[PDB]
Amino acid sequence: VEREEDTVRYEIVNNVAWVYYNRPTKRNAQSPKLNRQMLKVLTELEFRDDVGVLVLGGEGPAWCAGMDLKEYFRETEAEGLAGTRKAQREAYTWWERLRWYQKPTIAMVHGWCFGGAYGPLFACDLAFAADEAQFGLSEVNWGILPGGGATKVAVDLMPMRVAMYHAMMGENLSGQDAARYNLVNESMPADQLKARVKQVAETLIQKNWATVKYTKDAVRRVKEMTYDNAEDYLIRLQEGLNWFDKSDGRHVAMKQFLDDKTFKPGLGHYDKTKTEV
Amino acid sequence: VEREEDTVRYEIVNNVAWVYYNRPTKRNAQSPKLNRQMLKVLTELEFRDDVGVLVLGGEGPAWCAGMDLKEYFRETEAEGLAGTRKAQREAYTWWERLRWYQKPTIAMVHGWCFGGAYGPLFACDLAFAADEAQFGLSEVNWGILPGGGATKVAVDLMPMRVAMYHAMMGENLSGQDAARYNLVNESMPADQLKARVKQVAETLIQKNWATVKYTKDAVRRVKEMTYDNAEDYLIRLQEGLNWFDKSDGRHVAMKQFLDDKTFKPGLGHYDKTKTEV
Amino acid sequence: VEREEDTVRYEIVNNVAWVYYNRPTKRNAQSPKLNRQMLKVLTELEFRDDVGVLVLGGEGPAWCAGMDLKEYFRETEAEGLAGTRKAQREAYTWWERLRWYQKPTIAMVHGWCFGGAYGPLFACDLAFAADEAQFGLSEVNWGILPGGGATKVAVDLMPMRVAMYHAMMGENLSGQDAARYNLVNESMPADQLKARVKQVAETLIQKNWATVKYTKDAVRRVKEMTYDNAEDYLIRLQEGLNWFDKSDGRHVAMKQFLDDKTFKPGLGHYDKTKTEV
Amino acid sequence: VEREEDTVRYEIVNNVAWVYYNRPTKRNAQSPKLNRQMLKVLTELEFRDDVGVLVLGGEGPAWCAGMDLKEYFRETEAEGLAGTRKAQREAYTWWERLRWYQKPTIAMVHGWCFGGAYGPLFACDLAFAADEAQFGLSEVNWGILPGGGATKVAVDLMPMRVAMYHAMMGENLSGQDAARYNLVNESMPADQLKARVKQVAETLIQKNWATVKYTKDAVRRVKEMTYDNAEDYLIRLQEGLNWFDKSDGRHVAMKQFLDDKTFKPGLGHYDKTKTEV
Amino acid sequence: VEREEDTVRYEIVNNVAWVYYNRPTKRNAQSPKLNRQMLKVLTELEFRDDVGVLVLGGEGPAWCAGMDLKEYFRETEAEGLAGTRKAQREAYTWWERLRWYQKPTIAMVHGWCFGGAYGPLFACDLAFAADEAQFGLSEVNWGILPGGGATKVAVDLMPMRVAMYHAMMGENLSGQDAARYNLVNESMPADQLKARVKQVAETLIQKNWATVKYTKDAVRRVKEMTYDNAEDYLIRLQEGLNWFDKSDGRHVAMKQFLDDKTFKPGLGHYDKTKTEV
Amino acid sequence: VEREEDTVRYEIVNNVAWVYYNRPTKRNAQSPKLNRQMLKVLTELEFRDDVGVLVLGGEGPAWCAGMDLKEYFRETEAEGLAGTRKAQREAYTWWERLRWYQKPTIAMVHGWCFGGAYGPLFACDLAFAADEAQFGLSEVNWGILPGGGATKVAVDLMPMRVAMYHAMMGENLSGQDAARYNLVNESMPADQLKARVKQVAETLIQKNWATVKYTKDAVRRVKEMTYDNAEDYLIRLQEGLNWFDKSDGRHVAMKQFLDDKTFKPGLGHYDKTKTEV
Numbered sequence A, B, C, D, E, F: 001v002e003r004e005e006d007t008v009r010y011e012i013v014n015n016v017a018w019v020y021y022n023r024p025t026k027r028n029a030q031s032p033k034l035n036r037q038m039l040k041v042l043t044e045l046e047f048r049d050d051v052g053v054l055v056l057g058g059e060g061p062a063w064c065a066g067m068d069l070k071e072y073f074r075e076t077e078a079e080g081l082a083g084t085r086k087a088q089r090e091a092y093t094w095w096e097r098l099r100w101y102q103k104p105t106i107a108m109v110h111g112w113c114f115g116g117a118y119g120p121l122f123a124c125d126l127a128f129a130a131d132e133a134q135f136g137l138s139e140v141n142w143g144i145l146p147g148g149g150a151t152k153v154a155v156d157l158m159p160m161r162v163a164m165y166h167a168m169m170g171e172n173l174s175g176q177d178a179a180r181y182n183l184v185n186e187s188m189p190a191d192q193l194k195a196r197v198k199q200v201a202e203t204l205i206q207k208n209w210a211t212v213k214y215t216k217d218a219v220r221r222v223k224e225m226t227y228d229n230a231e232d233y234l235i236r237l238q239e240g241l242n243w244f245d246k247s248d249g250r251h252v253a254m255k256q257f258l259d260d261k262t263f264k265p266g267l268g269h270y271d272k273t274k275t276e277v
């Protein structure tokens, strides 16, 4: 998409950064330009005290139709290994920046999600789809295996049988099927999707943000640990959150529940407006 | 709950130990008193030749509403690190004793199941819920991450997307949702739950008890092994069961199927009354 | 089944090897004869340029009712450890040959699938069941734990709760339940099953066969890797596929999509008839 | 050793708890009495503000000659599985309490170290031996495999070849050989051993104690992680140490090096007497 | 080496099977003929009640100079993938049969040990070298990476730095260096090697053979487990050894130590001649 | 070191890129300027057809004295979390670029190597030290745990006991000790070090460069795999090297050994001047 700075756009609304792939006429294909610009935008939004949540959406009828077969594959193969490695590092680096983002991330998938879009899909903590969205590991249909981690995304989110069929047959899952097999959290009609995402973002914004970061990372990390190692790890993490959370939110919440009896944590969030312990 | 020995109760009925969290007016919150008494009760029931199955239920409207914010957190923080570590070891030790219990374990979850109740929920081999039960990682709602292993429980039982939403949003799953996402085996109306649990216990009691112990441990252990390592491990385990099972139940069953033709193992259990090989 | 060479049969139809367990009157039980003959048949079909897909079905009312309690267990125990180890190696070796087969594999499960049939069930990449099929870890019902890897199969395919219940209770899953819990891909009436399998095989045959092999192995392998290790591994695999695929199918497909615009990989396979890059 | 409270002794000298196995005439064999008393002593010393280091030594000519063949094995086998499991839990629990101890631990091994003494040997962070000490996995010589984790100790400390020979041949390593193969840190004549241990303890006491705890745990934990997972884990740990260390020792040390230039951390410890940042 | 049955020879002496690679004039290169014959010989010796130990040596100046560049590589590449896979399976299968052998195995390495000889070298439990032996990952010197697992052998036995240098530089280790870096147990002059191996074999033959098998497997297996998983695994293994060991050697040994006081297991093996418990 | 472009220097000599940390008067401390410039230099040298090997040395009396306590820690803490994360990503990213470098890497450590220098030390494939070099995890001496992966470096290279002592005691290893415990490959007098490194580089340059890359990565990767997974992985890697190596060096070498008999791979590298197969 001619200018690099035009390949991604964003708006800040009510402390949510709404970030969009912005190559609509190229179905939001991941070119090196988009991969560099997406990192730049993610890097500048990450530690803004007024950005609580990042939503990743797409302009036009695609969410993301994968890597750019022209600009990511053909043009880089022409500059040899050096060009291939530079292009790969640009794509992998922004998926990783999104995966470990300081703020909670949400995929808003209204349309086409193919191939190398699976990395960014997985890198979002939560994911909400339109019924009319279509998800495919289309890689087998153009003679390549599902790289950019896409095979691992399918295996880490979906049942083995479902991942195997998805990668071998290159057939598409509807939003409803993507939700049934846990590729995404939920599917709904396209005309309801933005409002649901906005509601989820507004709920996260009400939580202690430090607590949400430590929790979302804990979920990602304890997948790659034994039960017994994860038990000790979660204790170590809470000691870190104790340092990070200057608001001392656990003591604030304990006072509101035990002493004030103004909320029940089983039924709703503590009031982080209040600061008395 | 004033006296330590009153924090847990049990009944033995038809070789099933029905164990209940017994702090109903405190929603069965896990205080250090309950954590010590639960270990004591589990330890004394474990190797009783008349206890075939242990069911973990709760008195009052909660199953278990998590750790006691007053007695487990506030009062122990006041005695410093020493008090915190003593309290943590008491909670972790009984969840582990339950997780590796000599006898099959069943969670009977009729009501509230929150936070640090996830360890005991996972430590039960099987789990049956009331439709009216509510399951939550409420930790984020009082500003802490889901410790006492609860994050790992969510990740080891439920699809990653579901675990992520559950831990970040602190919203509750109904019994039906808890069953759909494999937090529990089944959900049913509260008025049907005890009878279903009683039926499941009576089925396990009819199996070779040594076989059930070796099998339930095998399921837990092979999650943390490669396929190829698990293949050899399962051979090693059967050699152990051969030693442990004095009834020589595999030869008893082989005679009943091959020679007597009185049962078909695909369709029902062998008669462990009979002892001829 | 008296002669070893009669324990397995196959037909080649439209480049699909239809292989059948052929001990119908013994419910296709895995005897040492069948284990040796199944390896021999799999070994001779594997690298045939006219075999694109292998389907594993069964003659008679069983798919596979497990190991032969008479010929695999009783008769080998009578020749001691030496006989037991020889028999075990014959069973494990053919399940492994099937699991890593050069060609895509499909389980066509019309009927009984018990115990040590789980290894071959898992060793097939894809699996399609009749509603009337019945799947059981019947091992607990004859006093043994689910060996021949069967416990690991249950844990690698199904949710932990479901695997635990399945192994401890020795109750059977219907085809529909086997599909809901991802033991198989799909369930349908028995009279529709062969046609669905034939359709799936004919779709795989249309893909680049080298691409399908590399992909199906990738799915199996990345389960046993961290996300970050799997990212690099998938790059290494594509470099291998580049060598293996003399048809240079990725460049063929790129031309058809970018230059010719005759297909869209999100919506269907490239035409591997064409050879221009 | 008739009274349980006599099976272990300790002295506090210059903030070092010198703990000794105290069954000299039974070569410090681990009986259930000693296993219970060792946990009690470790538990009461752990969080003493005047205990900086714990040294584990032995009275008489043995350090520890393993499990008590009479009181740990024979007498417990006589009370059946229940007695065996109680005895095993008592031994495993104190080795684990020592392995994760709040304070740095040192093994002072002057003499015999056999079998089930390997768990406590490994559970000590550091280990110093007399030339005249003798270390053996003597288990094979009395027909058992090296349990109580001893096989794993040998594999986690020594080269595979050395561990294999040690476990299969049941021959003894001298102190010098134990040091060459990294079973211990150092070996020296018995008459020099206590002074070296005293010197090592006095060096640890001069460090920031919170820093030593976080570091020693980090070493133990990162063995069971991939490089890339360990990188993130070590960041999480430092955030915890930031909370735990009220002395804010990293800022104290930075001032002494950058501003005051009174020490060089490459060459010695910062002065934790000073409190200015 | 013209006839397949001539590629391997063996002698039985004092219950030790002395097996030799027998292609001396081809430096004992692993051809498909040798790979098939080595499996056949290993398979027939394994469960002989008069074979306690297997030693793997070589005829002529090589132990094993790796895979046969002519018969294993060139001739099989000429029959395509099918020929390559058949040849690979023959080599891998016998290395694995040796690695998990029922009996203890010893490598007697008097001379050249190169490349694909590392699999068999590692598959032997113990290894003894001549000073004049030379060990090399010569693969880099003929433009291939160290396959047949050789890279993994180097990493599992030697320090990472040593393995890296060994694989990248294709320079040779002397016997003494091979012992210093734990590729083998010991190095000695060639004229002393056979007698040392004979002495080691005669020591293993005096141990309880079932105990040696369970122990040697435990060492190999606990490398691929967390400490805490290995603790439970070793308990499971002893339950298996209890079944396998009809001699009830642990009770025999306990009587000889506790009651008879005729041996000290720290200092020597129990007398397995005696059978009283 | 005032200008960013001055913090690193390099020379190309005989196809070796000699790269030096260039803040001699600050003992080559890793400031954000150096971390950015080191990535830039590594990135531009990596795919130069005239760069076969990269050596990492240091100007002045240090190799690398760790992170810059002023510019990496103090100044970034002053810009908050955003500044800390930016600085961490710059350091981690260049250590990783070096660790997976297309070309073989060598650490030339003539002097001080402290703390956060361990990441770059480990990221070099090979390492050669001066006797007068001093290696320390000095972190404990300034009250922090050994981050920037340094703890993991110590555990992945050195015996557990040695790593534990090194991290807890903050005492320094000499070059000779660093070599004995496998932190580096070799130690020699400082006046011999450059010539030895030059000789090692000139040997690597004579090998097939594609072969060296695939091999060095294989060594790093198979540490984090089971034996059985590593066996298959190494086959996959050779298929990749077959694609990457246009020189078809394995067939060139096979001709020189089998047909021409001009070299013996056990004793030296094939002549990659020659191109006939």
Ligand SMILES: CC(=O)SCCNC(=O)CCNC(=O)[C@H](O)C(C)(C)COP(=O)(O)OP(=O)(O)OC[C@H]1O[C@@H](n2cnc3c(N)ncnc32)[C@H](O)[C@@H]1OP(=O)(O)O
Pocket (backbone or CB within 6 Å): A257, A258, A264, A265, A266, A267, B025, B026, B027, B029, B061, B062, B065, B066, B067, B068, B069, B070, B112, B114, B115, B116, B117, B138, B139
């Ligand atoms: C660390 C962890 O494990 S987090 C613990 C789980 N976190 C939670 O969110 C549960 C905390 N408590 C809850 O929200 C309860 O389950 C509820 C509020 C949903 C139950 O609702 P209700 O039926 O309305 O009960 P209510 O809130 O009135 O509780 C009744 C009593 O139980 C006590 N109680 C309930 N949960 C807890 C708890 N986790 N710790 C301590 N006391 C508790 C209440 O303080 C109250 O005590 P009081 O009447 O003596 O003042």
Ligand SMILES: CC(=O)SCCNC(=O)CCNC(=O)[C@H](O)C(C)(C)COP(=O)(O)OP(=O)(O)OC[C@H]1O[C@@H](n2cnc3c(N)ncnc32)[C@H](O)[C@@H]1OP(=O)(O)O
Pocket (backbone or CB within 6 Å): B257, B258, B264, B265, B266, B267, C025, C026, C027, C029, C061, C062, C065, C066, C067, C068, C069, C070, C112, C114, C115, C116, C117, C138, C139
């Ligand atoms: C170790 C493992 O893999 S466990 C093996 C699986 N375990 C099982 O529970 C299956 C064992 N057998 C079964 O239960 C069968 O599938 C059944 C009974 C459900 C099939 O039901 P039916 O259609 O009624 O068949 P029926 O039991 O009459 O079997 C027919 C024949 O097959 C034989 N057969 C069935 N399964 C097996 C088996 N696993 N091993 C050996 N023979 C078997 C029967 O002995 C009988 O032989 P016969 O007629 O020559 O005497």
Ligand SMILES: CC(=O)SCCNC(=O)CCNC(=O)[C@H](O)C(C)(C)COP(=O)(O)OP(=O)(O)OC[C@H]1O[C@@H](n2cnc3c(N)ncnc32)[C@H](O)[C@@H]1OP(=O)(O)O
Pocket (backbone or CB within 6 Å): A025, A026, A027, A029, A061, A062, A065, A066, A067, A068, A069, A070, A112, A114, A115, A116, A117, A138, A139, C257, C258, C264, C265, C266, C267
């Ligand atoms: C390596 C990977 O990640 S694989 C990439 C994913 N693979 C895929 O199968 C997606 C490839 N493209 C698709 O199939 C598209 O999503 C479609 C065809 C389903 C979208 O359908 P349509 O709405 O009919 O769009 P259409 O195919 O006409 O595409 C519109 C434009 O986007 C371009 N485009 C679409 N996807 C890509 C892509 N992945 N790379 C580059 N350009 C692309 C098309 O070339 C076309 O460009 P043009 O009009 O300038 O010639």
Ligand SMILES: CC(=O)SCCNC(=O)CCNC(=O)[C@H](O)C(C)(C)COP(=O)(O)OP(=O)(O)OC[C@H]1O[C@@H](n2cnc3c(N)ncnc32)[C@H](O)[C@@H]1OP(=O)(O)O
Pocket (backbone or CB within 6 Å): D257, D258, D264, D265, D266, D267, F025, F026, F027, F029, F061, F062, F065, F066, F067, F068, F069, F070, F112, F114, F115, F116, F117, F138, F139
């Ligand atoms: C987080 C980590 O990586 S920990 C960093 C490693 N930690 C350490 O212990 C090293 C810290 N520094 C050292 O101890 C040095 O290597 C020494 C002191 C051993 C070198 O000894 P000397 O040769 O006597 O050098 P000296 O201490 O005088 O240092 C010379 C200059 O380098 C600076 N310097 C040395 N190391 C560092 C460092 N790690 N960060 C910042 N500046 C440093 C000194 O401040 C001094 O600056 P100045 O002269 O402008 O005031």
Ligand SMILES: CC(=O)SCCNC(=O)CCNC(=O)[C@H](O)C(C)(C)COP(=O)(O)OP(=O)(O)OC[C@H]1O[C@@H](n2cnc3c(N)ncnc32)[C@H](O)[C@@H]1OP(=O)(O)O
Pocket (backbone or CB within 6 Å): D025, D026, D027, D029, D061, D062, D065, D066, D067, D068, D069, D070, D112, D114, D115, D116, D117, D138, D139, E257, E258, E264, E265, E266, E267
């Ligand atoms: C399961 C495990 O952990 S295996 C335990 C370790 N196994 C071993 O091989 C050690 C067993 N015992 C030994 O061999 C001793 O260390 C020795 C024999 C080397 C010590 O040698 P000596 O100094 O000659 O001591 P000796 O054998 O005379 O033992 C002295 C006393 O300690 C007792 N004792 C020694 N080790 C043990 C033990 N592991 N369990 C129980 N009692 C023991 C002896 O029975 C004897 O008791 P008695 O005098 O009341 O009859």
Ligand SMILES: CC(=O)SCCNC(=O)CCNC(=O)[C@H](O)C(C)(C)COP(=O)(O)OP(=O)(O)OC[C@H]1O[C@@H](n2cnc3c(N)ncnc32)[C@H](O)[C@@H]1OP(=O)(O)O
Pocket (backbone or CB within 6 Å): E025, E026, E027, E029, E061, E062, E065, E066, E067, E068, E069, E070, E112, E114, E115, E116, E117, E138, E139, F257, F258, F264, F265, F266, F267
């Ligand atoms: C894939 C892998 O496993 S790599 C295999 C290991 N790679 C190697 O570097 C070893 C290859 N061969 C060697 O270098 C030999 O060990 C040597 C050269 C060191 C032995 O040195 P010498 O004693 O001088 O023996 P020489 O090279 O003359 O070999 C004698 C015979 O053995 C043959 N031979 C030796 N090694 C091999 C081998 N790996 N494959 C096939 N034939 C071999 C030689 O071709 C020669 O055959 P010929 O006399 O019939 O023509």
